[PDB]
Design a binder for this molecule. Structure first.
Ligand SMILES: C[S@@+](CC[C@H](N)C(=O)[O-])C[C@H]1O[C@@H](n2cnc3c(N)ncnc32)[C@H](O)[C@@H]1O
Length: 234
């Protein structure tokens, strides 16, 4: 995943003196990437098991200035106007209330502070929408929703956040490995496979469905993007 991550560093326009907050931080890859360039990274993740991974991994790469902690995006501990940068990467489709999360991002971000949000997203067409969302709840039962770009813009505007699409790009997925990494049972996998085999034309177009002649999926694409948001006023 080095591309999404590099873009954020290019787009973030770091400063020696900045403080960074990585939300849904995971094994903490974003949080570490930033570390050489900013003062301090803080990262939150909901699962405690992930805080530990993150924090030991930090230690393993011996970086002093990043630290992880447990919490949720819908309720960040931190004070208002207390970060220059916030990163959120392939985590939002997991939040149980993305509306609130943005509101919190808004709160805790400083004025003219930047929100670098990377994720994949539903196309505007609701039918294509369901398609890509249903393909992912099937793979990952923890998948809440990948909101659409209209939706992201409406949320940004709703929170005095100035929306800019830095760059889109298709996310190739190699079906076979995607399944492994995701741990899915062969029950669900059969539903995934039916799903991909009965794709509308529009669907197998928009998501690059490539299949073995036996119906067995080779590959497809998610729609990745990097929105950047900047806290202005209302
Ligand atoms: C798939 S990981 C994303 C990868 C990671 N953020 C990175 O940049 O490398 C999604 C993360 O979201 C966390 N998560 C799920 N719901 C959350 C929530 N409501 N608030 C904060 N984190 C959440 C999970 O623990 C998980 O680590």
């Amino acid at each position: 995943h080095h591309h999404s991550l590099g873009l954020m560093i290019k787009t973030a326009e770091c400063r020696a003196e900045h403080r960074v907050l990585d939300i849904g931080a995971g094994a903490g890859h974003t949080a570490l990437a930033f570390s050489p360039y900013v003062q301090e990274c803080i990262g939150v993740d909901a699962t405690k098991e992930m805080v530990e991974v993150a924090s030991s991994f930090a230690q393993e790469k011996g970086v002093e200035n990043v630290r992880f902690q447990q919490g949720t995006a819908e309720s960040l501990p931190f004070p208002d106007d207390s970060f220059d940068i916030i990163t959120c990467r392939y985590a939002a489709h997991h939040f149980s209330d993305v509306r609130k999360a943005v509101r919190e991002v808004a709160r805790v971000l400083k004025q003219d502070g930047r929100f670098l949000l990377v994720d994949h997203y539903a196309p505007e067409d609701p039918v294509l929408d369901e398609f890509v969302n249903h393909l992912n709840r099937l793979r990952d039962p923890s998948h809440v929703r990948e909101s659409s770009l209209s939706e992201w813009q409406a949320m940004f505007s709703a929170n005095q956040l100035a929306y800019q699409d830095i760059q889109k790009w298709n996310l190739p997925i190699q079906y076979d490995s995607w399944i492994k990494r995701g741990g899915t049972p062969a029950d669900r996998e059969k539903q995934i496979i039916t799903h991909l085999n009965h794709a509308s034309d529009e669907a197998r177009d928009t998501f690059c469905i490539t299949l073995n002649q036996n119906g067995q999926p080779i590959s497809f694409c998610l729609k990745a993007i990097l929105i950047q948001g900047i806290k202005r006023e209302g």
